[PDB]
Structure 1
Amino acid sequence: SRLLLNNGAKMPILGLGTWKSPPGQVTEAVKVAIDVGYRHIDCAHVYQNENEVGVAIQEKLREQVVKREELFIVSKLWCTYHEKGLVKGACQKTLSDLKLDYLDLYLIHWPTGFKPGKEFFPLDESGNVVPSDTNILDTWAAMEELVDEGLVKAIGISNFNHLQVEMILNKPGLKYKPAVNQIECHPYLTQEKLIQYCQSKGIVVTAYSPLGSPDRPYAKPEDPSLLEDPRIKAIAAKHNKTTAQVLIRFPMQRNLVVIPKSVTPERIAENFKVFDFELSSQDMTTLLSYNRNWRVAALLSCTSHKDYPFHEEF
């Protein structure tokens, strides 16, 4: 239900994603989720809706539905704020849009540093993405003491390959360990080498894009669907659950936290009814056997960034 983090705080094994969640519909999404019984909201600045996602949390707090410490609000530092001077300001902007006084987990969104400016994705005239010469260990020391101003309860990372995680681990003075490396992970990109490396290290795995990110802007020629896989669909009807409900239960039982995005009030509901049933060893190893090494989000414009997390095997 809640996983213990290496900072002593417990983290709800189930939460709501807001990437691709419109400002108009992401206030009312969160409010309904919370009502339904969600206590974990996954936010990011680059997602552009945190204000509207923070109007949602202030109504439930006014309304006495939840106390602040019942919730577990998560956010991530975008690539253009990677310099020591920019980091506190970016947590502070997130902190005022959401309208909270502390975050519980603050994550480093990507390993890749970009040029600081108004553009989330800086480009040159050759069209390619412009990098900051800052590194991970520098950026980590700016986050390590957001903790010391008492702005965040915990700090983490998103999309680091095992080697990247290691850098922080053997950094002299490493005052604060990574509580959480959040990553993509579904039946087609099963991720068990990173998942079974982070876990030996006390780092918690959040699996994002758990349903296939069915609405991320890319669609290819003939992309694969999980929410519509025949094999995955049988496994569900056995459990009389839905293919969503099965694709959300899979991470959970890998001891992973799961953040399925929804702006639909009856889906937000469905996604919550995942607590009352087990998948079998057959199901979990079948589901597992389905991996195809395919990712939704591969950051294709930082392929050549010195800090591109995806050239390493895991």
Structure 2
Amino acid sequence: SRLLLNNGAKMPILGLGTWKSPPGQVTEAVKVAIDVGYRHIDCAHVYQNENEVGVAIQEKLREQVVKREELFIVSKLWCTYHEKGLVKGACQKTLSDLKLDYLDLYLIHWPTGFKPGKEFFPLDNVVPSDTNILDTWAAMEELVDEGLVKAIGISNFNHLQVEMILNKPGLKYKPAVNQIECHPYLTQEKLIQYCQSKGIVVTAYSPLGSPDRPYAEDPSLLEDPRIKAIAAKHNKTTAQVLIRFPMQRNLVVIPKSVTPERIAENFKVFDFELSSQDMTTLLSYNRNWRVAALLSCTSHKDYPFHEEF
């Protein structure tokens, strides 16, 4: 139920996402998640709720429901902190809000660096930084040497950007994970095949198609009749099928939910198996549709989505 990372740690295949989870609902959501059995929580500074996520974690550690070593906490470095001197500072802010002394995994959220400041998305659309991916990676590597994070990774990096880090002169720490958008409408067969051949674990975000995305005629995965049929045959819900889908592709999945019953439902995905036919069918539903396309950074020198994969 856990995947081995290149650093020797074991990462729980199922995690709870926290993007869009209200500050007044995520503490209770994480508390319930931990009781239900979740041991992996996906976080990020830009989500503006790590302090509240941290409240839930501390309560459970205090209750002794779990030990710190049983939990796998993940967070990400936002685009406005790509400078060499701003990385440790961003990581420490997150550690304070979460009320932890170390993170299990720290990811470079997006390959695009923005102008450092108060705005998460600085504008003039989007002011870039002259920093590059290799300089930021070297700063991430220092976080490991100082003991702030157990492992470092990337997110939304295309194969060429992943290659750039892998061929870095004096590369000390290899990216442990590449978190990307993945579901039946954006299968990512090529990037997943690429990352998995390099010992990099793939985490699939927006597994249900992110039905509550801020940007709202759009296609719905949870409402797809073809996927509802597969779910009925296994007597499961379409969400459990959509969550079981990446698991059988050897991917870590992090569905988001602030609803106790759905959080519990999303956990009941270990007692069934999708046939090889069900899998091939789900893969054929690919349309190359993205929920997160970073539209504002279309002309950024490091925009990841111009290459095929």
TM-score in terms of structure 1 length: 0.98
Query: What does the per-residue CA deviation read over 1:194-227, in whole Å, with 9 as the maximum and x for residues that have no partner?
Result: 00000000000000000010001112xx000000
Query: Could you tell me which residue of structure 2 aligns to residue 242 of structure 1?
Result: 237
- Rounded to whole Å, the distance in 1 between the matches of 2:276 and 2:260 is 32
Q: Determine which structure has the larger helix proportion and give its number.
A: 2
- Cα shift at 1:158: 0.2
- Rounded to whole Å, the distance in 2 between the matches of 1:148 and 1:110 is 22
- Cα shift at 1:188: 0.5
2:163 pairs with 1:150? no
- Cα shift at 1:54: 0.2
| SS of equivalent to 1:178 | coil
- Rounded to whole Å, the distance in 2 between the matches of 1:130 and 1:24 is 32
- Rounded to whole Å, the distance in 2 between the matches of 1:234 and 1:256 is 23
Query: What does the per-residue CA deviation read over 1:118-140, in whole Å, with 9 as the maximum and x for residues that have no partner?
Result: 0000000xxx1000000000000
- Rounded to whole Å, the distance in 2 between the matches of 1:289 and 1:69 is 39
Query: What does the per-residue CA deviation read over 1:1-58, in whole Å, with 9 as the maximum and x for residues that have no partner?
Result: 1000000000000000000000000000000000000000000000000000000000
- Rounded to whole Å, the distance in 1 between the matches of 2:185 and 2:298 is 21
- Rounded to whole Å, the distance in 2 between the matches of 1:109 and 1:165 is 13
| SS of equivalent to 1:117 | coil
| SS of equivalent to 1:103 | coil
Query: What does the per-residue CA deviation read over 1:240-290, in whole Å, with 9 as the maximum and x for residues that have no partner?
Result: 000000000000000000000000000000000000000001100000000
- Rounded to whole Å, the distance in 2 between the matches of 1:254 and 1:67 is 29
- Cα shift at 1:311: 0.3
| SS of equivalent to 1:301 | helix
- Rounded to whole Å, the distance in 2 between the matches of 1:22 and 1:305 is 30
| SS of equivalent to 2:305 | coil
Query: What does the per-residue CA deviation read over 1:133-180, in whole Å, with 9 as the maximum and x for residues that have no partner?
Result: 000000000000100000000000000000000000000100000000
2:141 pairs with 1:141? no
- Rounded to whole Å, the distance in 2 between the matches of 1:245 and 1:164 is 32
Q: How many residues align?
A: 309
- Rounded to whole Å, the distance in 2 between the matches of 1:218 and 1:169 is 34
- Rounded to whole Å, the distance in 1 between the matches of 2:165 and 2:290 is 25
- Rounded to whole Å, the distance in 2 between the matches of 1:299 and 1:59 is 36
- Rounded to whole Å, the distance in 1 between the matches of 2:190 and 2:122 is 33
TM-score in terms of structure 2 length: 1.00
Runs of 4+ with deviation above 4 angstroms: none
- Rounded to whole Å, the distance in 2 between the matches of 1:65 and 1:171 is 42
Unaligned runs of 5+ in 2: none
2:114 pairs with 1:117? no
Query: What does the per-residue CA deviation read over 1:89-109, in whole Å, with 9 as the maximum and x for residues that have no partner?
Result: 000000000000000000000
Sequence identity percentage: 100
- Rounded to whole Å, the distance in 2 between the matches of 1:231 and 1:74 is 33
- Cα shift at 1:183: 0.1
Query: What does the per-residue CA deviation read over 1:77-98, in whole Å, with 9 as the maximum and x for residues that have no partner?
Result: 0000000100000000000000
- Rounded to whole Å, the distance in 1 between the matches of 2:188 and 2:85 is 34
| SS of equivalent to 2:7 | coil
Tell me how large the CA RMSD over aligned residues is.
Answer: 0.3
- Rounded to whole Å, the distance in 2 between the matches of 1:20 and 1:218 is 12
